[PDB]
């Protein structure tokens with residue numbers, strides 16, 4: 001009972017996972033994964049762009065059928081929605097101006113303005129640990145606004161996925177003056193364990209079909225060859 005067309009929501013402002021090229025086409029590792037899974041599922045798929053914080057609400061409202069948007073698999077989210085098996089890992093890390101003394105600690109970030117994606121696990125962490133304790137945490141509709149406000153000096157630092165920042169900003173023209181500030185931050189509760197396809201809890205058949213296609217594309221080496229387009233390391237993690 002899979003839909004004739006699976007509607008997949010994604011936030012196209014998170015290179016190299018999900019973004020738009022110059023003529024508006026969806027590109028990145030999430031898009032590649034989704035399209036490959038849809039192929040093996042033998043279903044048509046329609047990509048739907050949305051701000052990140054609108055994805056889970058759109059899913060719950062059945063305006064989309066799935067989310068592939070670096071969606072972290074967390075205990076909290078598992079109470080509202082279901083997930084496919086892990087698509088890849090996604091650690092979190094701060095960036096700031098090169099040579100910045102900033103570390104991902106309250107003491108370091110006091111007085112600093114820190115940008116986070118609204119609706120993200122990074123926002124959850126930053127709100128609880130930093131915002132409550134006086135740090136000017138600013139939440140943004142999308143990650144592109146964060147990068148812009150950073151380079152415009154409205155932000156001192158920003159918290160997002162390590163790989164997104166690296167491949168999508170630090171290794172891009174806009175980020176040549178910026179670097180990681182401190183190590184990545186582990187936090188079981190807030191950050192979860194990898195990303196997955198977000199799905200409605202009752203769509204058992206759809207989850208089975210994604211899980212099946214995902215295992216198959218990992219079995220035959222397609223995952224690693226697709227990954228190699230973007231990463232020279234183990235993006236899957238454990």
Ligand SMILES: NC(=[NH2+])NCCC[C@H](N)C(=O)O
Nearest residue numbers: 011014069070071072120121
């Ligand atoms: N396409 C995106 N904007 N992805 C952002 C994901 C941020 C983080 N992994 C989360 O699940 O909250």
